[PDB]
Design a protein around this ligand. Structure first.
Ligand SMILES: [Zn+2]
Ligand SMILES: [Zn+2]
Ligand SMILES: [Zn+2]
Lengths: 71, 148, 228, 103, 129, 173, 345, 211
DNA sequence: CGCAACGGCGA
DNA sequence: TTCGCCGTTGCGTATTTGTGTAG
RNA sequence: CUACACAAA
């Protein structure tokens, strides 16, 4: 229902920056302007968050659905 | 199952130290046999893994809708431009021994689905006693009737 | 070492030492192979099924020559030069000519194998060692599907009078209108090609669905006729 | 068809004995001769295609779903002709909207 | 044979020309014309159609023997009522025979035209055209 | 319309036609056909079925009975606690039918004549599609649906009968 | 009908069909208004004025509305085309009516009954009238003996009026399908009317035959419209063997996820709520309208000890522990009290 | 596969012990005599043509059943230009006189010359087959050495002991179904290349591919 | 949906 | 008088698993 | 227990 506390694959704690990432991503998408928002590159944002260049961690960070955005 | 129709039953669960890992520490959630592909022709899953490898590095979510233009050569070159190999393969080490495989292993994010078929629901074991039919005197039918 | 391989090493082991020894040897050889691949490693990749641009051009040329032969047959039909043999109508003879013309030549493997390293290609090694897959599988994945046949004939004009699909005109003569797929799976079929492939796949699923009941009734009748 | 002139009904043939008597239900007869002596016939694959597809062949140039080919209409001088491939013998008919009906 | 699968009528295969006769237009050539659309027309289409119609008229119906050659509507309609009050049967017939054509007395010649068109289409399919 | 020679389309990509797909799906609503069919039913078809097709006039042995229904109305589902509204979640939990009341008014003619008129009355209850114009969640915001225990992201299209949810199929005819 | 979605096993293969993504079901239209318009049309001869002889002698074409023969017209094609244009305008003829012209029996059929399948198709217009005019001019030049008759001919143009600006407006919510229909950009086509349509399967194919006068498409399709919602979940489905796309349509509907958004207020039986869901890294258009169920698992395609042979999968115990595909299964126990005899205690 | 062998049809024929008339995939393999001559494809093809069943209906372009009779007479107006060859046939066959009890029926058959040549069938062969099989008819034919071949068949009197129309129609059916050449029940007969073993003079077992 | 007795009436 | 025909009845159409729903 | 529906191999 939220971004997981740790990455499902390797256990890196992406949940430390889950909330900061969500709100910073909403902000960064807003200045960059449903599908065109998803194609905005978040490499720099996630790197500035401190998360490493790990396929699993960025995958689970950017793809996890937020229940609050749907309910 | 994957979104390309490749069903699978979870046969083995390994701890994090027993699972194979790439040189940069990436390890799988699922290990899928390559023999599931050649007869089933589920190239969409393979292409989706190749595309999602670069999507995860770029931090994007792209469209893989059917009949959209696709160029697997350009997707592989995109993998190369992202800093990976032309194929999505990487140097992998065996988690149990620590020895690298001689072959680079294709590893990447493939969207997988958990089909609602639970072994805890499907499994059944009955002993020598239980409810029997009044007419035939045989056991009742199946798990629902608590004998069969 | 394959399963169901008459004259294979396990069959000989069973013949000489007993089937239990053959089962033990199957387990032992399986452990040897798996422990070897524990270090060798085996994989299949999207690049394992990708043709080089030169091989792609060669496959395109092969398909173009097939379509050229088909167009020559069509030109013969336009001039009234299609003369069926006795017992065959002009339509049936034309259909046979188109079915033979659009068959993939055995040299379709040359571009496939020029793009393949047999020492490192997981897909090719699975196919060639008999582990899984076939040459038609590799050709469909990499080179092209070719002609879709349902009951040993092309796509019949079921949409309307003389029409196979809403995408093709009435009495179309091009091979693509009757189920010839020029694309491979890796290239990605177009919408009508995917419709024809779906027709073929649904036909296969229906065959598997109804053969079970027919063969089951036959099997029960045979069992009851023979069980005594 | 032999229509009775009194009651407007079909008349039977009744070839009795040496001639043809068009016996009707009401009783009137015409007898007749010559043409009325063909009891039955069958013609094997002679006369087809154009007769049974006359409406379709007429409408073909206006049906947008019919195939077209890049050749001139001699009567009309367009560059395209509607192509028809009818029957099990695959007769190719090129027809134009002007009226050209290349047999 | 034309069969109406309504409530009162079922398994009763009334000959087509009899149904045409019960709705007026007693002329048998006119009944044929309702199927062929042109009585005095050439071409192998109309000839084959008309020959089939001849054979259909000149066959002994095992269950409509008395009215097979009858030319008045009264006897045919009364026979139909027995097998299933003249104006009652003929009014209850049009409530079950092509209601989309209309259910009133006025829409009967057009109902017969539509029935002839249906028979023409079936016989065209018989030609394998 | 303008001319076809001067339509600028060379930069129309294949991912632009997915916008046409989106327009089609948004127009239909992905469920909208059967909700619209049900709305058409209980707006015009049920009145058609009642006002027409039911003006019976029979004669018995002699005696003749003639009566027709003039007004028909279906209300949103109701419950007994003063006729409180029946919410879909309450029907699902309590095992009720999400059926809406049907109100009929009929006039009897006998023939001497006796013009008797019957006041409108509840004749029965008609099952209600979720999201139909007679559903309590028809014109509701997502938050408003959430406060009544409803799924805000679902479109409806089904029936609640004896607690279960049922789908009336699209039959091939 | 989705060409992929079906059962993959059993007798139910191909039994339960699925609507395609753009397919709709028509409601009953104003058949009486169109009937009045047709019977007041000077081009349609009434049934009581033309006899069966005149229909075949003058080549009259029978006109049907909802299967009811209402008259005859001088030429079926012109009447069908005129009413198609009227439907394109949308004022006098409802856009959801079916105008079918049978060229083999010369009949115009109008259908407005409930249950017709419809889908919107973009209209392809061409300059075939101007093309023919140029051809006749070039022929006249040839007759006169001009040595430059080719310059009289004009190239053939066929195209759709859909433009990328309209795509942007559709995505921006300004433009809707109703505005597309009212502007004449697209029209609804029913399977019976689809037999009168020559459809380009893609805008790529329409562009390929843009100047081809021998391929004069009436409409242009969007290739994703041949699939249903569950079939569009599969990514790069046209790169997969279609039977496996059918397999996915079956498996895409048993996938665990957020089975309901109001689950805590429901007492449901045999229902599984999976906590964590992810958008696919490679999503499809099906996820614009339905929630994605599943996770973006990292998958290694490799042999690892022979525990994943014959459709087995080796899973990470840690991935299971962290919540990968974890959820809550729900059962219910409803027991009635019958009458006053029974009670709970 | 394709001669209905689809499904369980052939196994159902085998296991249900279906009769010969109920089989949909009946086939024979016939070897030529003199194993020295079963090596020429042309001879085998000639034999295959010679054994394939040919009925009268396959050589008929069209046939007409006329009520007209003949006297050694009222005639149909359409086939009026036939009197020339009727006179020719009557004068060239002084032994086959028209029946003294000839019946008032006729069958005017138009022969397909292209089919006749393509099957190496002669007019004399057809007429001889017709007379032998159908004694109570009187065959009259045009001249083959030319306008198409016309054959007129008059029922004698004995075909009638049902109206005479019905008897004439059944006689038409019997004539059209009469076999001209070949053995019954053989729709097609194609030549196949056979692999067979044989022992030579040296005692070696050689696989003969050219049979 | 098909297959096969069947048994009663036309030959 | 001995057979075809023809409605007219029955019989049968893979196996083993689950879950519901109702009567 | 008798339907029926949804599923699995
Ligand atoms: Zn990670
Ligand atoms: Zn008379
Ligand atoms: Zn012209």
């Amino acid at each position: 229902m939220l971004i997981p506390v740790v990455c499902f694959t390797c256990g890196f704690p992406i949940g430390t920056y889950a909330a900061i990432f969500d709100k910073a991503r909403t902000e960064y998408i807003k200045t960059k302007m449903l599908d065109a928002s998803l194609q905005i590159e978040l490499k720099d944002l996630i790197t500035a968050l401190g998360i490493p260049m790990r396929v699993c961690c960025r995958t689970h960070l950017i793809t996890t659905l937020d229940y609050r955005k749907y309910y | 199952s994957s979104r390309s129709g490749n069903k699978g039953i979870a046969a083995l669960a390994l701890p994090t130290s027993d699972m194979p890992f790439t040189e940069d520490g990436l390890q799988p959630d699922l290990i899928v046999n390559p023999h599931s592909h050649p007869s089933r022709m589920t190239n969409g899953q393979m292409i989706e893994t190749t595309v999602g490898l670069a999507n995860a590095l770029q931090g994007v979510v792209t469209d893989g809708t059917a009949f959209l233009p696709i160029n697997v050569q350009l997707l592989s070159e995109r993998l190369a431009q992202e800093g990976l190999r032309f194929n999505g393969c990487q140097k992998m080490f065996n988690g149990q021994t620590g020895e690298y495989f001689d072959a680079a292993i294709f590893i990447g994010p493939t969207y997988h689905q958990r089909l609602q078929k639970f072994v805890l629901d499907d499994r059944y074991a009955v002993a020598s006693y239980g409810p029997t039919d009044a007419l035939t005197g045989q056991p009742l039918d199946g798990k629902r009737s608590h004998g069969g | 070492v394959g399963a169901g391989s008459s004259g294979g090493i396990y069959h000989l082991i069973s013949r000489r030492y007993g089937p239990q020894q053959a089962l033990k040897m199957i387990f032992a050889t399986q452990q040897l192979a798996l422990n070897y691949v524990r270090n060798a490693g085996f994989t299949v990749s999207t690049a394992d099924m990708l043709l080089t641009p030169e091989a792609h051009q060669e496959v395109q040329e092969i398909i173009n020559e097939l379509l050229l032969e088909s167009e020559e047959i069509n030109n013969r039909l336009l001039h009234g030069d299609i003369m069926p043999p006795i017992g065959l109508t002009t339509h049936d003879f034309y259909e046979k000519l188109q079915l033979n013309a659009l068959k993939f030549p055995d040299r379709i493997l040359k571009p496939i194998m020029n793009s393949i390293n047999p020492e490192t290609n997981g897909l090719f090694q699975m196919v060639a060692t008999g582990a899984k897959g076939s040459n038609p599988n590799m050709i469909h994945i990499m080179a092209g599907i070719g002609q879709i046949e349902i009951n040993t004939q092309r796509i019949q004009p079921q949409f309307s009078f003389g029409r196979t699909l809403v995408y093709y005109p009435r009495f179309a003569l091009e091979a693509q209108a009757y189920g010839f797929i020029c694309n491979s799976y890796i290239a990605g079929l177009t919408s009508p090609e995917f419709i024809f492939g779906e027709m073929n796949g649904r036909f296969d699923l229906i065959n598997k669905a109804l053969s079970t009941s027919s063969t089951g009734y036959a099997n029960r009748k045979a069992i009851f006729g023979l069980q005594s | 068809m032999k229509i009775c002139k009194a009651c407007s009904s079909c008349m039977v043939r009744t070839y009795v004995d040496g001639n043809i008597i068009f016996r009707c239900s009401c009783g009137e007869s015409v007898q007749g001769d010559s043409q009325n002596l063909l009891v039955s016939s069958k013609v094997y694959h002679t006369g087809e295609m154009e007769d049974k597809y006359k409406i379709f062949i007429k409408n073909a140039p206006f049906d947008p779903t019919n195939c077209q080919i890049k050749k001139d209409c001699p009567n009309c001088h367009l560059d395209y002709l509607t192509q028809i491939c009818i029957g099990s013998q695959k007769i190719i008919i090129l027809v134009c909207r002007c009226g050209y009906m290349s047999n | 044979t034309i069969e109406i699968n309504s409530t009162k009528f079922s398994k009763l295969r009334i000959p087509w020309y009899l149904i045409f006769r019960m709705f007026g237009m007693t002329g048998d050539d006119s009944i044929i014309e309702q199927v062929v659309f042109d009585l005095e027309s050439n071409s192998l289409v109309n000839t084959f159609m008309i020959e089939i119609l001849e054979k259909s008229i000149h066959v002994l119906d095992p269950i409509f023997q008395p009215v097979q050659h009858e030319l008045n509507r009264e006897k045919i309609i009364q026979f139909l009522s027995e097998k299933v009050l003249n104006e009652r049967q003929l009014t209850i017939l049009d409530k079950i025979l092509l209601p989309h054509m209309g259910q009133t007395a006025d829409t009967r010649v057009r109902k017969l035209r539509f029935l002839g068109l249906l028979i023409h289409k079936i016989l065209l399919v018989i030609m394998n055209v | 319309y303008g001319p076809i020679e001067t339509v600028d389309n060379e930069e129309l990509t294949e991912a632009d036609m997915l916008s046409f797909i989106s327009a089609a799906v948004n127009s239909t609503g992905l469920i909208g056909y059967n909700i619209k069919s049900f709305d058409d039913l209980m707006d015009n078809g049920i009145p058609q079925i009642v006002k027409q097709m039911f003006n019976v006039d029979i004669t018995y042995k002699s005696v003749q009975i003639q009566f027709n229904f003039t007004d028909v109305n279906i209300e949103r589902p109701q419950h007994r606690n003063n006729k409180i509204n029946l919410l879909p979640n309450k029907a699902r939990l309590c095992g009720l039918s999400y059926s809406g009341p049907v109100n009929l008014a009929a006039e009897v003619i006998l023939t001497e004549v006796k013009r008797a008129s019957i006041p409108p009355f509840q004749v029965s209850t008609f099952p209600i599609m979720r999201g139909s114009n007679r559903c309590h969640t028809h014109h509701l915001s997502k938050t408003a649906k959430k406060e009544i225990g409803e799924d805000p992201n679902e479109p409806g299209g089904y029936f609640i009968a004896r607690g279960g949810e049922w789908v009336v199929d699209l039959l091939e005819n | 009908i989705c060409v992929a979605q079906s059962a993959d096993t059993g007798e139910k293969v191909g039994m339960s069909k699925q609507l395609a993504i753009t397919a709709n079901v028509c409601t009953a239209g104003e058949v009486l208004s169109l009937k009045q318009r047709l019977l007041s049309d000077p081009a349609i001869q009434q049934l009581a004025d033309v006899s069966n002889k005149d229909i075949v002698r003058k080549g009259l074409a029978r006109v049907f509305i909802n299967g009811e023969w209402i008259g005859c017209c001088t030429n079926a094609f012109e009447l069908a085309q005129r009413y198609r244009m009227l439907r394109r305008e949308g004022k006098v003829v409802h856009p959801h009516t079916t105008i079918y012209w049978d060229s083999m029996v010369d009949e115009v059929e109008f259908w407005l009954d409930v249950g017709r399948l419809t889908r919107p198709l973009l209209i392809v217009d061409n300059n075939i009238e101007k093309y023919n005019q140029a051809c006749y001019k070039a022929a006249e030049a040839r007759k006169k003996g001009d040595k430059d008759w080719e310059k009289h001919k004009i190239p053939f143009i066929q195209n759709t009026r859909f433009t990328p600006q309209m795509a942007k407006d559709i995505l921006a919510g300004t433009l809707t399908l109703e505005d597309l229909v009212a502007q004449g950009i697209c029209e609804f086509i029913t399977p019976e009317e689809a037999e009168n349509c020559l459809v380009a399967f893609s805008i790529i194919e329409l562009r390929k035959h843009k100047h081809d006068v021998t391929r004069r498409f009436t409409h242009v399709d969007v290739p994703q419209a041949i699939l249903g919602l569950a079939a569009l979940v599969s990514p790069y489905a046209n790169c997969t063997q279609p039977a496996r796309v059918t397999y996915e349509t079956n498996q895409g509907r048993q996938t665990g996820g957020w089975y309901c958004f109001s689950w805590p207020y429901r007492v449901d039986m045999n229902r599984f709520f999976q906590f964590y869901n992810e958008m696919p890294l490679v999503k499809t258009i099906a996820h614009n309208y339905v929630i994605p169920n599943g996770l973006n698992t990292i998958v290694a395609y490799m042999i690892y000890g022979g525990y994943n042979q014959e459709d087995s999968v080796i899973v990470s115990q840690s991935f299971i522990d962290r919540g990968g595909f974890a959820g809550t299964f729900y059962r219910e126990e409803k027991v009635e009290l019958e009458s006053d005899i029974e009670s709970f205690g | 596969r394709s001669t209905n062998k689809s499904g369980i049809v052939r196994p159902q024929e085998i296991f249900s012990a279906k009769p010969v008339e109920a089989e949909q995939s009946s086939e024979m393999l016939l070897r030529l005599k003199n194993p020295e001559v079963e090596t020429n494809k042309t001879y085998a093809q000639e034999i295959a043509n010679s054994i394939e069943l040919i009925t009268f209906e396959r050589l008929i372009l069209q046939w007409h059943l006329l009520y007209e009779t003949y006297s050694s007479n009222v005639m149909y107006p359409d086939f009026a230009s036939d009197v020339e060859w009727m006179t020719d046939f009557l004068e060239n066959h002084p032994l086959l006189q028209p029946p003294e009890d000839i019946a008032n029926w006729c069958i005017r058959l138009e022969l397909n010359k292209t089919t006749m040549i393509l099957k190496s069938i002669s007019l004399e062969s057809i007429i001889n087959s017709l007379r032998a099989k159908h004694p109570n008819t009187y065959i009259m034919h045009s001249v083959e050495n030319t306008i198409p071949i016309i054959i007129r068949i008059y029922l004698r009197e004995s075909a009638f002991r049902a109206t005479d129309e019905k008897i004439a129609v059944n006689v038409v059916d019997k004539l059209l179904n009469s076999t001209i050449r070949g053995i019954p029940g053989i729709k097609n007969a194609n030549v196949v290349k056979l692999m067979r073993h044989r022992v030579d003079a040296q005692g070696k077992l050689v696989r003969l591919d050219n049979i």
